[PDB]
Structure formats: structure tokens, C-alpha cells
Structure 1
Amino acid sequence: DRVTTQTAGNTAINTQSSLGVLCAYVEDPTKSDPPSSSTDQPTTTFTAIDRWYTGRLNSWTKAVKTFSFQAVPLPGAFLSRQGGLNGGAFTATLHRHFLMKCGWQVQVQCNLTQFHQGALLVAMVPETTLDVKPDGKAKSLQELNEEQWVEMSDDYRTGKNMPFQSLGTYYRPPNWTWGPNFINPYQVTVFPHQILNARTSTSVDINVPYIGETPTQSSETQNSWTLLVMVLVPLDYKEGATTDPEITFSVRPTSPYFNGLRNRYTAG
């Protein structure tokens, strides 16, 4: 058992010691319909893009602390090209369609030995902004390698690290305390998730269909499923064990929905 050879398009990934699947909210998530708000003929799926793209994430050592997480947005990951991960043909498509709509398979990657311990937590939270400190500039591919992890401060816990706006100098400068977007780390296992540790598994999967505030959000602005990995108990290993294991990931779109041709996107 426990050997899951998943084949799509022309690629095929298997993880020999895996666990299973985990759908969300509907037992078969790939089913959908073309959106009702549009009127144009939607460009549906095609077999050249039904794919596992993979991409390297930062490694992890002794020096990490509890609740420290990486988080990658989606499909905004495909735009800025983190970790040697690009959509390739897929970005060349969704630059040219003002409406985009799709659900996601993910299986994440590690492999610790049998003389280790330490629990990760792979989960994809819905509808968050865990990539910006309030200056207004979204962080990009250069400033990922200076930290390797987000040390989980209190300002994400109290919702103080969401981008506010220019108050206008007619008023008083305020005293902010709360925002509705936050992360409560004692609570984060209410989302589709599974404990990945050196106990039983090596690589493990999530699966999720669509959620949205509208039938179809915009092309290059929305980010529904950020996925975040966070450590609950740190690693311990004696001198001679394999130092600093490596993390990558594998993202699959399922049943894409495009709408609306124009020129290739050039940012204003």
C-alpha cells in the first residue's frame, strides 16, 4: 500500500511512503461549471496544461523557533517566479485573460531520517495577505533568502501587520490595534491540513476546490489559497546526521477557467 502514482498531462509524481488524500467540503472537488456572470465563451481546460509544476522552498535548520512559517501565495507565485517555479505556458496564458478561476492539488515535500524528530504543519489557509509588511510594496524574490523563515511575532497574532492606508493629514495620526486578517497559531488546524513529521510520513498532500467572494475574481490581484508550512517542535540531531534538509513543493491546477482576451499584461 501507500504508493500513489498520480499522472496528469505528461508528468507523473509518486511518493512511496505517503498517506492518502484530503479533499475539502465536497468529496470530489474537481467538478465545476463555467461561471454565470460572464457572457463570452470561456476557454476551458486543455491537456498541455494539466500538470504538476514543482518548485524549491527554503531549507530549515536547528535555529528556527516555534510557529515560524513560510507562506506562498497563489496564483501570485506564478507571477514573481519564486524558487525556480514558473507557470511557463500557464503564465503566458493567464496574462491574457482578465478572469481566472481554478482549484488546486498540492503535495508538499520533505524526507527526514529515522533518527530525527520534529513536526511541520502543511496547511493552506483561505484568503490571507501573509506576504507584506505595511509599506504597500508586495515582497518579491530577492528578500526571501535573508530570513529563510518568518519569525512569528506578536504583530501577526494581534493583526497589526496588515497594510493600512494613508490617513490624510487633516486628521490625527491614529493608534491602531486590530485587523480582521491575522494568524492565531494555537488555532491554525481548522483548515485542510495534516501533521507531517519524521514519525510516519515523508511527503503528504492537501486538496482543495474553489472558494470565492464572487463567481470569478480578477486575474492578477486575488490570492485565495496561500499555503503555509510552520514548525511546531524543532529538530534535534547528533553530529553525523544529515544537516539541514530541503523543502520543495508541487502545485497542480484542476479545470482552469479563462475569460477575456486582450494584449499581454504590462503593469501600469
Structure 2
Amino acid sequence: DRVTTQTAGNTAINTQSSLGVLCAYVEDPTKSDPPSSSTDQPTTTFTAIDRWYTGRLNSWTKAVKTFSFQAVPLPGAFLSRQGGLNGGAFTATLHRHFLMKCGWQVQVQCNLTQFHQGALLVAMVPETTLDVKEQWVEMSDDYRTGKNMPFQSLGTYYRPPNWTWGPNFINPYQVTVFPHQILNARTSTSVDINVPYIGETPTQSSETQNSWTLLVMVLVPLDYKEGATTDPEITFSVRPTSPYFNGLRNRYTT
């Protein structure tokens, strides 16, 4: 039924309100192949990294508006340790390899009660720059238009143009095209999404890629009568499925 335990290595995570794992674009997104752009023998999965990594995420309050989101890059949250997400031997393997190729498997836990309302949109969003320059990022007109995405400054030679659009916008009404599940306060306390590797190349650089971004967006604001539990904490669990590390070198220095 709704009680599933997902063992991965020495890690087993439980939920008793499971909505079923949302597999993205294929039946088994764990099935993956070695990259065709690297002639060396890749480093496949091993039991110290074939596990779940649990980080915290910022609390969800009544003051958090509609479409106010919160983004977790993959594997970008392993590098910067976003939300206390120490990647262990996965990040230790990732800093020593130039290319990395994996799909992901996420679970975002957020336990509400039967007296709470509200909804979260937990989605895996491909190729966004939402970690680049509060507890929650607000959906302004700059995020809806891509107007605030990073750019090369044209210099003093050019007249600086009125920037009006960028392709890494967020249309906040179309975030359910992504591999998503809604974390309703009256159906479930956690959601499961399994995504495969995607990218412009068969394998991408370990330090730079943002092929998947975990996106937790508020669709309905949190509401409760006073006396209930205020500000429930959002946490997430990330499991890399089938990594193909390539290009072994020394640990990454800037």
C-alpha cells in the first residue's frame, strides 16, 4: 500500500503516505550506459555512494506567498553542502573526477497534519540557474521572464540594452510539465521522484552541471488555526542512480 521503505546501501528511508515513485520519461530511469565521449574506464556505482543523502530545507510558514519557490541543484548541493547536505564519499568521488553522468532519485519529506492546509509543488526541473544570485525565493516578474538570469556584461563599448527576457525563465503555471508530485497537506507527508540522466553531452563536467534542479514551490499557502504546529520543516533525500565518473584527477581546486 502506501507504506514503502526504499533501501539503498546502508540507508533505508520510510514513508507511510507514499504516492508512488514518479519515474521520469522512462520505465526504469536507473538503467544507464557508460558515456561514449570518454575512452577511459569509468567509475561506476559502489556501495559507499549507492545511498540516500538527507539534507534540510528551509521551513514553510504562513508568510510564504504563492509561487514562492526554493531550489536545490543536483549535484550543486553536494558541492556547496546546501542544507547540511554533506555528500560523503559521493562528493569525495565527484571532486576527483572531471566528468560525471548520473540520474537522480529524490524524496522530499514534509509532514503536515489533518488540521493544516496548503500545497507544495516538488518538481525536478531540467537546466535552470535558480541557485544563482530570505528562506524562500519570491516569484517576481524577473523570475517569470528570465530577466534576472546571469549574463556577460557587454562592456563600455556598447550601449547597455534593456534586458527583457531570458530562456531560463520560470513560468510558474507550467511547472507541472516537469517530473513533479504535489505535496498536499491532506494526502501525503512525502513525495518520490526518480529521474534519469539528461544533458547536452553524454557526460558533463562535475563542477559546473545543473542538469537537474529540485524545485519546491508553494502552490497554496500554509494555513492553520493557532494552537497547531507552526512552521513545519521541509527535508529532502537525494540518491544518485547509476553514476559514471570519468576523468580521474586531483581534488578540485579553484
TM normalised by structure 2 equals 0.97
Deviation per residue, 1:63-98 (Å, 9 max, x gap): 111100000111010111111111111111111111
Deviation per residue, 1:91-145 (Å, 9 max, x gap): 111111111110111010111111111011100110000122xxxxxxxxxxxxx
Runs (4 or more) in structure 1 with deviation over 2 Å come to none
Q: Match of 2:85?
A: 85
Secondary structure class of the residue paired with 1:13: strand
Secondary structure class of the residue paired with 2:79: helix
User: What's the offset of the Cα at 1:186?
Assistant: 1.3
Aligned mates of 1:217, 1:262 — CA distance in 2? 15
Deviation per residue, 1:144-197 (Å, 9 max, x gap): xx9111111001111101011121212212111111110011111111111111
User: What's the offset of the Cα at 1:235?
Assistant: 1.7
Secondary structure class of the residue paired with 1:118: strand
**Where does structure 2 lack aligned partners over 5 or more consecutive residues?**
none
Query: Of residues 241, 244, 247 in structure 1, which corresponds to 2:231?
Result: 244
Aligned mates of 1:206, 1:98 — CA distance in 2? 27
Q: Match of 1:94?
A: 94
More strand by share: 2
Task: Please tell me whether the aligned partners of residues 10 and 51 of structure 2 are also in contact (alpha carbons under 8 angstroms).
Answer: yes
Aligned mates of 2:2, 2:75 — CA distance in 1? 30
User: What's the offset of the Cα at 1:60?
Assistant: 1.2
User: What's the offset of the Cα at 1:199?
Assistant: 1.6
Aligned mates of 2:123, 2:28 — CA distance in 1? 19
How many pairs does the alignment contain? Answer: 253
**Where does structure 1 lack aligned partners over 5 or more consecutive residues?**
133-145
Task: Please tell me whether the aligned partners of residues 125 and 212 of structure 2 are also in contact (alpha carbons under 8 angstroms).
Answer: yes
Secondary structure class of the residue paired with 1:92: helix
Secondary structure class of the residue paired with 1:83: coil
Aligned mates of 2:41, 2:164 — CA distance in 1? 47
Task: Please tell me whether the aligned partners of residues 96 and 252 of structure 2 are also in contact (alpha carbons under 8 angstroms).
Answer: yes
Query: How much identity, in percent, do the aligned residues show?
Result: 100
User: What's the offset of the Cα at 1:53?
Assistant: 0.7
Aligned mates of 1:158, 1:93 — CA distance in 2? 37
Q: Match of 1:147?
A: 134
Aligned mates of 2:41, 2:79 — CA distance in 1? 25
- The two structures, once aligned, show a CA RMSD in angstroms of 1.3
Task: Please tell me whether the aligned partners of residues 113 and 186 of structure 2 are also in contact (alpha carbons under 8 angstroms).
Answer: no
Aligned mates of 1:148, 1:182 — CA distance in 2? 21
Deviation per residue, 1:224-263 (Å, 9 max, x gap): 1111111111122112111111111000001111111211
Secondary structure class of the residue paired with 1:107: strand
Secondary structure class of the residue paired with 2:90: helix
Is it true that 1:30 corresponds to 2:30 in the alignment?
yes
